[PDB]
Design a protein around this ligand. Structure first.
Ligand code: HEM
Length: 291
């Protein structure tokens, strides 16, 4: 099935910058969430999980249809906690009812990365809501207790290569694991609501110990109070991933540029953009607007 991007009727860059801005202003205002981490990280994860159900083989799932709004997908165990990002976006959607669900979930992620002093992420509009029976089944999002071979094979289904995977994983600088949500507990670093390359630096430079958490799952822990999932740690066990990790630990601009590309790609997988669609939008941050 082909999913052709269809611009919300009559809308242009300024309309979407207004949505961006409302998201960004609420991100700033609602700062208490998650022990003052704020909603940035869970909005990035919402964008990823609503996009990451995609299957390149038959174009099922993906960001286009905004299917997270249906109970099979919002109740996926893999999505535990993302209801907080959805609830955040609800007043945004009420103010701007014309935006599609897929466009809002993906734009939430872009806005969060940028407002957290991350790279600019070009973003295209035109996702169209699809019906409840187009919601992908549970089980398409990745397990955390696995090795590099798992990770590499998993991401082939999203048409991501080694560089794209290692870049995307850098988003684990953000937020934290929550025991009651995933069976893992702890942040990955100190700067967890500012977008930086800290994930790679911590992988290489902390002294990690393989411990069991209080849900009886293994994770890697440091004396600084940071953690890595087994799938994170796999990026330094596999020599191909390791090279790339070192590259991003040593070049913040390269990480930003590669993350931006991979994240846009993730958010656009499955969508066909007509030849005469608008160019991708690059939104100004609140700071750049003086707001
Ligand atoms: C092998 C792939 C991946 C696995 C197994 C994985 C697994 C996890 C797990 C278990 C959590 C903790 C959930 C919780 O307890 O709240 C988490 C959090 C998160 N992940 Fe992933 N993840 C992967 C890839 C990604 C990618 C590709 C992105 C986005 C580019 C991403 C962004 C995030 C963010 C931002 C959080 C923090 C959420 C919060 O603080 O509420 N993850 N991930």
């Amino acid at each position: 099935l082909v999913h052709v991007a269809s611009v919300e009727k009559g809308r242009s860059y300024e309309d979407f910058q207004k949505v961006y801005n409302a998201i960004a202003l609420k991100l700033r205002e609602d700062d208490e969430y998650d022990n003052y981490i704020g909603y940035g990280p869970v909005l990035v994860r919402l964008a990823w999980h609503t996009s990451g159900t995609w299957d390149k083989h038959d174009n099922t799932g993906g960001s286009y249809g905004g299917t997270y709004r249906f109970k099979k997908e919002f109740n996926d165990p893999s999505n535990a906690g993302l209801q907080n990002g959805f609830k955040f976006l609800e007043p945004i959607h009420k103010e701007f009812p014309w935006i599609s669900s897929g466009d809002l979930f993906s734009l939430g992620g872009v806005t969060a990365v940028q407002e957290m002093q991350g790279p600019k992420i070009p973003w295209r509009c035109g996702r169209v809501d699809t019906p409840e029976d187009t919601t992908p089944d549970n089980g398409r999002l990745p397990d955390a207790d696995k090795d590099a071979d798992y990770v590499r094979t998993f991401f082939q289904r999203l048409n991501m290569n080694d560089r794209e995977v290692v870049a995307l994983m850098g988003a684990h600088a953000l937020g934290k694991t929550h025991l009651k949500r995933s069976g893992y507990e702890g942040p990955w670093g100190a700067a967890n609501n500012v977008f930086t390359n800290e994930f790679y630096l911590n992988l290489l430079n902390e002294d990690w110990k393989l411990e069991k958490n209080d849900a009886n799952n293994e994770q890697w822990d440091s004396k600084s109070g940071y953690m890595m999932l087994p799938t994170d740690y796999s990026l330094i066990q596999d020599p191909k991933y390791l090279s790339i990790v070192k590259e991003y630990a040593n070049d913040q601009d390269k990480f930003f540029k590669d993350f931006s590309k991979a994240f846009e790609k993730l958010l656009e997988n499955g969508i066909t953009f007509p030849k005469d669609a608008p160019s991708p939008f690059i939104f100004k941050t609140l700071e750049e607007q003086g707001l």
